[PDB]
Design an enzyme around this catalytic site. Sequence first.
Site, mmCIF file in Angstrom:
data_model
loop_
_atom_site.group_PDB
_atom_site.id
_atom_site.type_symbol
_atom_site.label_atom_id
_atom_site.label_comp_id
_atom_site.label_asym_id
_atom_site.label_seq_id
_atom_site.Cartn_x
_atom_site.Cartn_y
_atom_site.Cartn_z
ATOM 1 N N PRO A 64 1.090 -1.188 0.045
ATOM 2 C CG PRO A 64 -0.644 -1.646 1.732
ATOM 3 C CD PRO A 64 0.938 -1.963 1.157
ATOM 4 C CG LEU A 75 -1.012 23.659 4.896
ATOM 5 C CD1 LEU A 75 -1.658 24.558 5.737
ATOM 6 C CD2 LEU A 75 -0.620 24.591 3.451
ATOM 7 C CD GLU A 76 6.371 25.625 2.735
ATOM 8 O OE1 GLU A 76 5.827 26.788 3.237
ATOM 9 O OE2 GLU A 76 7.347 24.903 2.132
ATOM 10 N N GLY A 77 5.514 23.344 8.458
ATOM 11 C CA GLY A 77 4.748 24.242 9.827
ATOM 12 C C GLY A 77 4.973 22.790 10.534
ATOM 13 N NE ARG A 78 1.674 19.562 10.211
ATOM 14 C CZ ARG A 78 0.119 20.280 10.065
ATOM 15 N NH1 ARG A 78 -0.040 21.110 8.286
ATOM 16 N NH2 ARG A 78 -1.495 20.585 10.303
#
Lengths: 61, 61, 61, 61, 61, 61
Positions: A1, A8-11
């Site tokens: 699988p 979004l960017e920011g993690r």
Amino acid sequence: PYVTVKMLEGRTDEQKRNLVEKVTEAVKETTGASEEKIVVFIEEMRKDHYAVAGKRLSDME
Amino acid sequence: PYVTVKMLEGRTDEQKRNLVEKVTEAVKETTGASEEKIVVFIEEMRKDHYAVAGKRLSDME
Amino acid sequence: PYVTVKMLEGRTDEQKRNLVEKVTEAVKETTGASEEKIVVFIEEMRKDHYAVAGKRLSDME
Amino acid sequence: PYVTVKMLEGRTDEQKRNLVEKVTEAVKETTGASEEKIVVFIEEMRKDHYAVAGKRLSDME
Amino acid sequence: PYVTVKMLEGRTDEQKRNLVEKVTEAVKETTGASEEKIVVFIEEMRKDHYAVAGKRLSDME
Amino acid sequence: PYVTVKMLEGRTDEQKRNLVEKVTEAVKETTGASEEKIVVFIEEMRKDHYAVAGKRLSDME
């Protein structure tokens, strides 16, 4: 699988490592897929390349 | 965030329901995103449309 | 440029024809690209293959 | 509806904002989709990662 | 590596088998990747789901 | 025909040029597709955005 996660960017790098761990497990137990067969791709989006209702997130509060 | 799960045909309707559920919780708890902002797409493949090492699964003996 | 439109099954053939047309003009007039260089792909989803907040549309009550 | 627009680098931030506006409208009126349900993703390609007829655009005039 | 080939419906089963084979060798010999690490996905389109210059193929006269 | 090649960063510009050449040829001869109709996209993955068996390649030897 094959799992593609578009967010979004920011993690943090840690949040990403946990994401892969958790998501892989979620798939392993609900689809009977063998662990070494579960692949995860992370795709980050830029607020100026992502819109909803006609307005890019870069143009919002 | 957007999660696309690509896997071979065959899973039961129940398995798919659990996949969506489990995968969504895995995202929620690992990225901070809120449930109504988490989308899951399921994409099924045919053994004759998926290949590894130059051999479609349908052609593996 | 390449535009992929992913939406639920159900639209009429006419609606799809208008989608391709309208979307192509929107690209042409907004990016400078020329018509014969604008490609549109239409991808239809099943309510049981699309989920939001851990609930496939097919399972929503 | 989810719209992905794949195009080459080289467009202004304004052209991108207009693209999202126009494309979202094109979809709203041809598919009867609710505005807050229309999502747009912009994906930029590098000339050295895009080829036609066997030749990458980075290797052309 | 992962190779996705998107083309119109119509190819024979044999053609698809050759596609997977040829494409896999092309990747192997050109990137250094090993066969069991090369995956090929085949995706078929309908003439009424593919458009160029605002005209779906199915609508071309 | 549209071919997307998803592979890890770390390949030379030459390997990429050869990839496009070879892959385009592989498709031309196995599908009877006209050369100017064969498009190739290269997508590079970051080891910290690609996982297998629950572990990102960035977290492996």
